[PDB]
Amino acid sequence: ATAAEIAALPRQKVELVDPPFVHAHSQVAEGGPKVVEFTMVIEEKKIVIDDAGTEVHAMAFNGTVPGPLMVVHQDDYLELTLINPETNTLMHNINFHAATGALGGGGLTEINPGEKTILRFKATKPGVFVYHCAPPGMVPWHVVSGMNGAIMVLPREGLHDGKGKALTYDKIYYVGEQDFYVPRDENGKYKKYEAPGDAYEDTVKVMRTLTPTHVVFNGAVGALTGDKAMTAAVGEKVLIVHSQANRDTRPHLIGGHGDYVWATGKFNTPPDVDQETWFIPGGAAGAAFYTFQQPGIYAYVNHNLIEAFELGAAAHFKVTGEWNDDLMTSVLAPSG
Amino acid sequence: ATAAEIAALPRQKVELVDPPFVHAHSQVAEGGPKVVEFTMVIEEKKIVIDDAGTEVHAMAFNGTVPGPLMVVHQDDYLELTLINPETNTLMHNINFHAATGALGGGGLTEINPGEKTILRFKATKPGVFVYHCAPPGMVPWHVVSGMNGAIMVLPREGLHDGKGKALTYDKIYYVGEQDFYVPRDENGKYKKYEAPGDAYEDTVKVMRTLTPTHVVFNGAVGALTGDKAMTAAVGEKVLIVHSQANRDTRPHLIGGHGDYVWATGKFNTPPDVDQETWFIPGGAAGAAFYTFQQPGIYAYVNHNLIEAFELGAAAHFKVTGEWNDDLMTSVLAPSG
Amino acid sequence: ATAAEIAALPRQKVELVDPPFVHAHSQVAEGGPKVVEFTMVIEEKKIVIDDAGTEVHAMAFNGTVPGPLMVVHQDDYLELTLINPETNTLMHNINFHAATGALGGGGLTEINPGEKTILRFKATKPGVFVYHCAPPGMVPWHVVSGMNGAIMVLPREGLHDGKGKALTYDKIYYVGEQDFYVPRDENGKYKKYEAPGDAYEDTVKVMRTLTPTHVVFNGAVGALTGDKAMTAAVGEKVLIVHSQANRDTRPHLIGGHGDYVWATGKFNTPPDVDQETWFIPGGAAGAAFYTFQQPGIYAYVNHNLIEAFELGAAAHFKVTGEWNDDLMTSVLAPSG
Ligand SMILES: O=N[O-]
Ligand SMILES: O=N[O-]
Ligand SMILES: O=N[O-]
Ligand SMILES: [Cu+2]
Ligand SMILES: [Cu+2]
Ligand SMILES: [Cu+2]
Ligand SMILES: [Cu+2]
Ligand SMILES: [Cu+2]
Ligand SMILES: [Cu+2]
């Protein structure tokens, strides 16, 4: 398309919402290609990632870890206004794995505190994709400080299974998984720092062990539990988008399955089916579609169980509805 | 199905056999859906896992690590009587990744020493699936103590390749891979404990490093080598089911291939073909089908070769038959 | 083929070139099956892997890490003359994951310094496959000392997408990824040695931590950058073959994608498409096909960003051509 044709396309400003929720959208595209506008302010902020009070100097797109999910359709243009407030101390940029050119956009979005930039790219490929900050020379440090999220580029005709049958979800959740590398003192207690820069050297030493101290969903151990647990109902169709910008993960819905899983996150690649545990490599997003069949509590985890239950990678689903004894039943309850 | 229809289904008790062998079964289903009954007694016992007398307080379904492979067909029901003898000291349960509801069955089978339970679930999805104990609050500890196994839910019409052609194996083996985390004292010697609970704190410390001290097949270094090597003959079709309940693995048959590999373990997902090394994420089982073409010794390993030859993840196959010079030949033997 | 039929086949002597380049070949087979001859001399030599002067005692096929890429077509025979100079100190052999029998050839090619051997095998399966040395009892040590490479067995009809449409590349590059485990002294300084065997004990201790000190392409940090950056032009189709003989990797072309990716490396397994980051398990090779659409510098990395930017797993592509503002444009450049 020419500059004139792009200038003529309708524009729609979208208000982002915080993970695990996703801003309102249509699965099947409304009309022809549009320039979808988003705005995100970067916030360097202290966040607590566990019940003990462990602190991390997060680098957060839109103030959250992960950054919010942006949703557009194939061949729409995503136009992002990215702002780096003067209150921040580091330069930041953004790299969309969904985009083509200039390192995903990082080469055109390096902004120092007090600057902003507007990047536009054509979403040519359908699927869920990671986005993350990547300043040359300090790439992993920003990413493992939480400066990453994902976007979803829906086919214009919505989702379909491998044989062309439509798959329409009732609800969608975005689970961003974060590996953190928090320095510890001689007592084995996590350290706290005044400014992000103070923690650099100590953090890089932990990073080099390739062993995170915490592996969490939505920025903290237990973030998606209790009143923040995800919800569904028997018969409800749920799409769970999951991303990990730096390290591998293996999602598993305890008590359920991934009925259709685009493990690579790309919609033109037919989904695997009937999955117990799927795999998303570091640097990618994946998506699983499931129709709940049993009520009760479910745990959604990274199935390296040490990472799930010792390091923090566990979320819960609260599901309403009638129990199905055909599917499962306790013939003899625990007894002598 | 109605309530009467379920109650009318035939019940059949099956005798289990220890891994890597598999109990008697038919690839194509015999008769209509059935309630297949299995019974497993849980044994907490000390086992030696290496050539240095290193001990692990194993938590073993049916007394073996891994627990035995249970085989049923799609839409059969699996009805398991699980027994936890009064001589054990810990509460246990079972979670079938093949099952739907109550955390895979874990929520309905929590049995203390001196108790038993019977769980029934409908095997609605075909494939090989992991099963493992998962007591709330102590999930990875039980799993990495060897309390895991797998089941196979065969399609009622048996296995097929991506084009619908039948794949009938002559024999099947179940290789359960286990990551162990054995504590060491300041001198580097593995520690021994009187009771399982005594090792809990020390073991979790090792678990959190995400670095196993041992990675083994059938519960010990060398368990499937030498006189315990698996066997085959040139021309024989072999299915190798592999599971890892907590950590990733990458099986490889040294000297052969995976002709058809259901890497995700689900039969409704077309198998990959001509595989050199396949990948099974922690929390899943996979299956590989291979027709042997050359006699001799083969090594079957986790292809992170440090895990295989330093940590213990290596098995052998002894194959009989005639050598095929067309496939391979020494044109010039090692010489000056 | 009978011995006579094979003897009547034409022979072609190939000249190998150093990675990341690939020797001359035709994508579509020229004529019928042939016996393709290759010769490689094993070189035990010191290589410097980082800018701190860190040394590794490399065990290099053809004098390079990785060893060179060998290209043949399905059902051709690969006849390798392997030489172990008397100037070397250890016994070596070769195992082709592409071959069938004798542990992939290792059982028929064990050569001490001063010996040579000639192995012939039929390339029955199409795809890219790892090859590596594997001396019984010292397997991982030789592999992580750089003694590994890959071969590509092209379909006789060249490459095709999932629907059978031809995929023809303009350029091809071979990236061999290597995990190194270099011993450190009590001051954190990397140790140096005057003989390969002198480093065995120390290296094994590091290998057992499953934590490499370096993860690099083509044997060294920054190897494939600057004077060795790979090149292309907008509109050019490029195949990137990637191998890792011992440990998992997750390739990603920063600023681009894997339009078609044979993640398992096997051409009869349909390729995934529109990939952001693909996954290659330790012990395998994979291949990605991409058509460049934007000029500029691209970074090709293992997307665990710590491995890429702290440990050494990053390469560059320098692409010429016109910028495409439809695909991406800076609406507002970084500004106050
Ligand atoms: O099914 N989760 O251990
Ligand atoms: O070729 N197996 O190390
Ligand atoms: O987009 N790769 O950092
Ligand atoms: Cu940043
Ligand atoms: Cu990236
Ligand atoms: Cu248990
Ligand atoms: Cu599980
Ligand atoms: Cu060697
Ligand atoms: Cu190998």
Short mmCIF file of C-alpha atoms in Angstrom, two decimals, chain C:
data_model
loop_
_atom_site.label_atom_id
_atom_site.label_comp_id
_atom_site.label_asym_id
_atom_site.label_seq_id
_atom_site.Cartn_x
_atom_site.Cartn_y
_atom_site.Cartn_z
CA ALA C 1 20.84 -51.67 -4.17
CA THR C 2 23.08 -54.75 -4.33
CA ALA C 3 26.85 -54.23 -3.94
CA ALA C 4 27.05 -54.31 -7.75
CA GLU C 5 24.33 -51.70 -8.24
CA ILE C 6 26.02 -49.35 -5.80
CA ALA C 7 29.39 -49.91 -7.50
CA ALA C 8 27.88 -48.78 -10.80
CA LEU C 9 26.64 -45.48 -9.41
CA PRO C 10 28.43 -42.29 -10.38
CA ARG C 11 30.72 -40.75 -7.78
CA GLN C 12 31.18 -37.06 -7.02
CA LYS C 13 34.02 -35.65 -4.93
CA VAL C 14 32.96 -32.62 -2.92
CA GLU C 15 35.15 -29.81 -1.62
CA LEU C 16 34.01 -28.64 1.82
CA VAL C 17 33.96 -24.99 2.85
CA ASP C 18 34.10 -23.48 6.35
CA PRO C 19 30.87 -22.55 8.14
CA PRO C 20 28.73 -20.57 7.90
CA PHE C 21 29.21 -21.02 4.19
CA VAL C 22 28.01 -24.21 2.46
CA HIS C 23 29.72 -26.09 -0.37
CA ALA C 24 28.33 -25.86 -3.90
CA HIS C 25 25.33 -28.07 -4.58
CA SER C 26 22.04 -28.07 -6.46
CA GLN C 27 18.73 -27.91 -4.64
CA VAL C 28 17.02 -30.21 -7.13
CA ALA C 29 19.04 -33.39 -7.63
CA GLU C 30 21.06 -33.54 -10.84
CA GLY C 31 20.50 -36.99 -12.25
CA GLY C 32 20.13 -40.21 -10.32
CA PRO C 33 21.56 -41.45 -7.00
CA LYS C 34 25.30 -41.12 -6.54
CA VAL C 35 28.01 -41.80 -4.02
CA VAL C 36 29.08 -38.43 -2.72
CA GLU C 37 32.61 -38.36 -1.36
CA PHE C 38 33.88 -36.14 1.46
CA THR C 39 37.14 -36.02 3.37
CA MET C 40 37.72 -34.48 6.79
CA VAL C 41 40.88 -34.28 8.85
CA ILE C 42 40.36 -34.01 12.60
CA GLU C 43 42.28 -31.20 14.27
CA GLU C 44 42.85 -30.91 18.02
CA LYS C 45 43.68 -27.22 18.39
CA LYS C 46 43.26 -24.30 20.79
CA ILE C 47 40.53 -21.82 19.95
CA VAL C 48 39.95 -18.47 21.66
CA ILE C 49 36.26 -18.11 22.42
CA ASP C 50 35.82 -14.62 23.93
CA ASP C 51 37.53 -11.24 24.08
CA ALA C 52 39.05 -12.11 27.46
CA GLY C 53 41.30 -14.62 25.69
CA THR C 54 39.49 -17.66 27.09
CA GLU C 55 40.70 -20.87 25.51
CA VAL C 56 39.05 -24.16 24.69
CA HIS C 57 40.91 -27.24 23.52
CA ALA C 58 38.76 -27.85 20.45
CA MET C 59 38.38 -31.22 18.75
CA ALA C 60 37.53 -29.99 15.28
CA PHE C 61 36.35 -31.85 12.21
CA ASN C 62 38.05 -30.15 9.24
CA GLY C 63 39.65 -27.71 11.68
CA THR C 64 36.49 -25.78 12.51
CA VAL C 65 33.77 -25.54 15.17
CA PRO C 66 31.25 -26.50 14.00
CA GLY C 67 32.48 -29.02 11.50
CA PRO C 68 31.42 -28.26 7.89
CA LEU C 69 27.98 -28.83 6.42
CA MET C 70 27.78 -31.77 4.03
CA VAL C 71 24.99 -31.71 1.44
CA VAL C 72 23.65 -34.73 -0.43
CA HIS C 73 20.22 -35.77 -1.71
CA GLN C 74 17.83 -38.43 -0.44
CA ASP C 75 19.00 -41.93 -1.34
CA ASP C 76 22.46 -40.78 -2.42
CA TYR C 77 25.23 -42.46 -0.43
CA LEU C 78 27.59 -40.34 1.70
CA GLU C 79 31.10 -41.75 1.75
CA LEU C 80 33.31 -40.07 4.31
CA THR C 81 37.04 -40.50 4.54
CA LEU C 82 37.87 -39.46 8.11
CA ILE C 83 41.47 -38.83 9.16
CA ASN C 84 42.97 -38.64 12.64
CA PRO C 85 46.52 -37.18 12.29
CA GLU C 86 49.37 -38.62 14.34
CA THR C 87 49.72 -35.05 15.66
CA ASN C 88 46.50 -35.63 17.66
CA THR C 89 46.40 -37.22 21.11
CA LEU C 90 42.94 -38.82 21.39
CA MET C 91 40.90 -41.46 19.60
CA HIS C 92 37.91 -40.05 17.68
CA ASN C 93 35.06 -41.32 15.49
CA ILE C 94 31.93 -39.97 13.85
CA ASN C 95 28.22 -40.63 14.29
CA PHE C 96 25.75 -39.35 11.70
CA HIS C 97 22.23 -38.95 13.06
CA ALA C 98 21.27 -39.31 9.39
CA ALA C 99 22.62 -42.84 9.20
CA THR C 100 21.19 -46.18 10.21
CA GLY C 101 23.31 -48.73 12.06
CA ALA C 102 26.43 -49.02 14.25
CA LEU C 103 25.40 -46.13 16.49
CA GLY C 104 25.22 -43.91 13.40
CA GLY C 105 28.68 -44.93 12.27
CA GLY C 106 30.66 -44.44 15.48
CA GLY C 107 31.01 -48.17 15.99
CA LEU C 108 32.77 -48.52 12.63
CA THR C 109 34.95 -45.40 12.67
CA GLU C 110 37.00 -45.41 15.90
CA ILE C 111 40.42 -44.14 14.82
CA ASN C 112 43.50 -43.52 16.93
CA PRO C 113 45.99 -40.80 16.00
CA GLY C 114 47.73 -41.92 12.82
CA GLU C 115 44.73 -43.80 11.43
CA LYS C 116 41.99 -43.13 8.90
CA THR C 117 38.74 -44.85 7.94
CA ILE C 118 36.14 -44.73 5.19
CA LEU C 119 32.44 -45.03 6.04
CA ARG C 120 29.60 -45.20 3.58
CA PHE C 121 25.91 -44.91 4.40
CA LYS C 122 22.68 -44.40 2.50
CA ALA C 123 20.88 -41.09 3.14
CA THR C 124 17.42 -42.58 3.29
CA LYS C 125 15.69 -39.77 5.18
CA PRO C 126 15.49 -36.12 4.05
CA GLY C 127 16.35 -33.26 6.39
CA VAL C 128 19.15 -31.58 8.27
CA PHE C 129 20.87 -33.86 10.82
CA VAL C 130 23.56 -33.46 13.43
CA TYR C 131 26.81 -35.47 13.21
CA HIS C 132 29.29 -35.68 16.05
CA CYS C 133 32.13 -37.62 17.61
CA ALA C 134 31.17 -40.07 20.38
CA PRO C 135 34.03 -42.19 21.79
CA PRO C 136 32.59 -44.75 24.23
CA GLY C 137 33.07 -43.44 27.76
CA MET C 138 33.98 -39.90 26.74
CA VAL C 139 31.01 -38.91 24.62
CA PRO C 140 29.81 -35.54 25.91
CA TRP C 141 33.39 -34.37 26.43
CA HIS C 142 34.25 -34.55 22.73
CA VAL C 143 30.90 -33.07 21.70
CA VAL C 144 31.22 -30.03 23.98
CA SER C 145 34.82 -29.62 22.89
CA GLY C 146 33.29 -28.66 19.53
CA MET C 147 33.38 -32.01 17.76
CA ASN C 148 30.05 -31.78 15.99
CA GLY C 149 28.47 -30.49 12.80
CA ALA C 150 25.51 -31.26 10.56
CA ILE C 151 24.55 -32.49 7.09
CA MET C 152 21.57 -31.67 4.90
CA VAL C 153 19.85 -34.43 2.94
CA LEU C 154 17.77 -32.56 0.37
CA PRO C 155 14.68 -34.18 -1.17
CA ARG C 156 15.56 -35.17 -4.80
CA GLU C 157 12.99 -32.58 -5.87
CA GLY C 158 14.34 -29.80 -3.63
CA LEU C 159 12.37 -28.13 -0.82
CA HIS C 160 8.58 -27.65 -0.75
CA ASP C 161 6.08 -26.04 1.62
CA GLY C 162 3.24 -27.94 3.29
CA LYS C 163 1.09 -27.94 0.17
CA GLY C 164 3.85 -29.07 -2.17
CA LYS C 165 4.80 -25.66 -3.60
CA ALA C 166 8.51 -25.38 -4.30
CA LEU C 167 10.65 -23.38 -1.91
CA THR C 168 13.86 -22.32 -3.58
CA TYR C 169 16.50 -20.39 -1.67
CA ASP C 170 19.05 -17.91 -3.04
CA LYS C 171 21.45 -18.34 -0.12
CA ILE C 172 22.09 -20.83 2.65
CA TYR C 173 24.08 -20.46 5.84
CA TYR C 174 24.98 -23.00 8.51
CA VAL C 175 25.05 -21.81 12.11
CA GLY C 176 26.49 -24.36 14.54
CA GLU C 177 25.68 -23.45 18.15
CA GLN C 178 28.06 -24.62 20.83
CA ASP C 179 27.75 -24.83 24.61
CA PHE C 180 31.18 -24.61 26.31
CA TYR C 181 32.07 -25.43 29.93
CA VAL C 182 35.31 -23.65 30.80
CA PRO C 183 36.91 -24.22 34.24
CA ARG C 184 37.57 -21.17 36.47
CA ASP C 185 40.09 -20.67 39.28
CA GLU C 186 39.14 -19.52 42.79
CA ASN C 187 39.27 -15.92 41.52
CA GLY C 188 36.72 -16.45 38.76
CA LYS C 189 39.41 -16.47 36.08
CA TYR C 190 39.15 -19.00 33.24
CA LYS C 191 41.89 -21.63 33.38
CA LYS C 192 44.27 -22.48 30.53
CA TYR C 193 45.90 -25.85 29.84
CA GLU C 194 48.73 -27.18 27.62
CA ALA C 195 46.95 -30.41 26.64
CA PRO C 196 43.33 -31.53 26.02
CA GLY C 197 43.56 -34.32 28.59
CA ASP C 198 44.83 -31.93 31.26
CA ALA C 199 41.45 -30.19 31.25
CA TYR C 200 39.25 -33.31 31.44
CA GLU C 201 38.58 -33.53 35.21
CA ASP C 202 38.03 -29.77 35.58
CA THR C 203 35.76 -29.57 32.53
CA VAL C 204 33.63 -32.51 33.66
CA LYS C 205 32.94 -30.77 36.96
CA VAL C 206 31.62 -27.76 35.04
CA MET C 207 29.67 -29.93 32.57
CA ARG C 208 27.81 -31.53 35.47
CA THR C 209 26.36 -28.17 36.53
CA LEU C 210 24.49 -28.21 33.17
CA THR C 211 25.35 -24.50 33.05
CA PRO C 212 27.58 -23.48 30.15
CA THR C 213 30.03 -20.62 30.69
CA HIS C 214 29.69 -19.70 26.99
CA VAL C 215 27.03 -20.38 24.32
CA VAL C 216 28.36 -19.36 20.93
CA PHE C 217 27.92 -19.59 17.20
CA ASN C 218 30.80 -20.82 15.05
CA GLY C 219 33.06 -21.40 18.05
CA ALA C 220 33.39 -17.93 19.59
CA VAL C 221 31.65 -14.87 20.97
CA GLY C 222 30.89 -12.47 18.15
CA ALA C 223 32.19 -14.97 15.58
CA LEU C 224 29.44 -14.27 13.04
CA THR C 225 29.55 -10.46 13.33
CA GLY C 226 31.59 -7.77 11.57
CA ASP C 227 33.90 -9.34 9.02
CA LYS C 228 31.83 -12.53 9.41
CA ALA C 229 28.30 -11.13 9.49
CA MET C 230 26.06 -13.05 7.08
CA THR C 231 24.68 -11.05 4.19
CA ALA C 232 21.55 -10.78 2.08
CA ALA C 233 19.43 -8.30 0.15
CA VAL C 234 15.74 -7.37 0.26
CA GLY C 235 13.89 -9.91 -1.85
CA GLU C 236 16.44 -12.65 -1.26
CA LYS C 237 15.33 -16.05 0.04
CA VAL C 238 17.67 -17.50 2.67
CA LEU C 239 17.79 -20.89 4.38
CA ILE C 240 19.39 -20.86 7.85
CA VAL C 241 20.43 -24.32 9.07
CA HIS C 242 21.01 -24.37 12.86
CA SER C 243 22.38 -27.26 14.93
CA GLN C 244 23.06 -27.94 18.59
CA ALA C 245 24.47 -31.40 19.31
CA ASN C 246 24.15 -31.28 23.07
CA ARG C 247 21.74 -28.66 24.33
CA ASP C 248 18.44 -26.95 23.46
CA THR C 249 18.29 -23.68 21.56
CA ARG C 250 15.52 -21.31 20.40
CA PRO C 251 16.56 -19.42 17.26
CA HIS C 252 15.12 -16.02 16.42
CA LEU C 253 15.91 -13.56 13.61
CA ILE C 254 15.54 -10.15 15.26
CA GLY C 255 13.71 -7.90 12.85
CA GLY C 256 12.50 -10.86 10.80
CA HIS C 257 10.79 -14.26 11.06
CA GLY C 258 11.04 -17.89 10.04
CA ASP C 259 8.54 -17.88 7.13
CA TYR C 260 8.81 -21.66 6.95
CA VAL C 261 10.57 -23.61 9.70
CA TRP C 262 11.31 -27.31 9.75
CA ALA C 263 11.78 -27.10 13.49
CA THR C 264 12.50 -30.83 13.82
CA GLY C 265 14.78 -30.46 10.79
CA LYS C 266 13.02 -33.22 8.85
CA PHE C 267 11.63 -32.34 5.43
CA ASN C 268 8.85 -34.94 5.37
CA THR C 269 7.41 -33.23 8.50
CA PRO C 270 5.55 -30.14 7.18
CA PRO C 271 7.18 -26.86 8.23
CA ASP C 272 5.66 -24.49 10.76
CA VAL C 273 5.03 -21.01 9.37
CA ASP C 274 5.29 -17.34 10.35
CA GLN C 275 7.55 -18.24 13.26
CA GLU C 276 8.85 -15.63 15.68
CA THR C 277 11.10 -18.02 17.62
CA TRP C 278 11.55 -21.73 16.88
CA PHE C 279 12.91 -24.53 19.05
CA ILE C 280 15.66 -27.05 18.34
CA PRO C 281 16.31 -29.67 21.02
CA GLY C 282 19.81 -30.66 21.99
CA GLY C 283 20.98 -33.38 19.62
CA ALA C 284 19.26 -32.01 16.51
CA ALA C 285 19.41 -29.63 13.58
CA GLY C 286 16.63 -27.41 12.29
CA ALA C 287 16.15 -25.17 9.25
CA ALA C 288 14.27 -21.89 8.66
CA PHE C 289 13.42 -20.28 5.31
CA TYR C 290 12.96 -16.47 5.16
CA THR C 291 12.53 -13.85 2.42
CA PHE C 292 14.08 -10.56 3.53
CA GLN C 293 11.73 -7.57 3.19
CA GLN C 294 13.71 -4.81 4.91
CA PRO C 295 17.34 -3.65 4.67
CA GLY C 296 19.52 -3.09 7.71
CA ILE C 297 21.31 -5.07 10.39
CA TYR C 298 19.52 -8.05 11.91
CA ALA C 299 20.61 -10.01 14.95
CA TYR C 300 20.09 -13.79 14.83
CA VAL C 301 20.09 -15.20 18.35
CA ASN C 302 19.28 -18.05 20.71
CA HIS C 303 16.30 -16.23 22.33
CA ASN C 304 17.09 -16.95 25.95
CA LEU C 305 18.48 -13.35 25.89
CA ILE C 306 20.96 -14.10 28.67
CA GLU C 307 22.46 -16.83 26.51
CA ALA C 308 22.45 -14.49 23.50
CA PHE C 309 23.76 -11.30 25.10
CA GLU C 310 25.69 -12.37 28.17
CA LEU C 311 26.89 -15.79 27.06
CA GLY C 312 27.66 -15.23 23.36
CA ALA C 313 24.81 -16.59 21.23
CA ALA C 314 24.32 -13.73 18.76
CA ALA C 315 25.08 -13.37 15.05
CA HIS C 316 24.33 -10.55 12.59
CA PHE C 317 22.98 -10.27 9.07
CA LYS C 318 23.71 -7.15 7.00
CA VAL C 319 20.97 -6.67 4.43
CA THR C 320 21.00 -4.26 1.48
CA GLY C 321 18.02 -2.83 -0.34
CA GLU C 322 15.28 -0.24 -0.08
CA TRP C 323 13.36 0.45 3.10
CA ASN C 324 9.65 -0.44 2.99
CA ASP C 325 7.57 2.18 4.84
CA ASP C 326 4.35 0.18 4.41
CA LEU C 327 5.76 -2.63 6.57
CA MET C 328 7.26 -0.23 9.14
CA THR C 329 7.76 3.49 9.61
CA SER C 330 8.68 5.93 12.36
CA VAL C 331 5.66 8.28 12.46
CA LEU C 332 7.36 10.40 15.12
CA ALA C 333 11.09 9.91 15.73
CA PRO C 334 12.42 9.88 19.31
CA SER C 335 11.92 13.45 20.51
CA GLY C 336 11.23 15.60 23.57
#
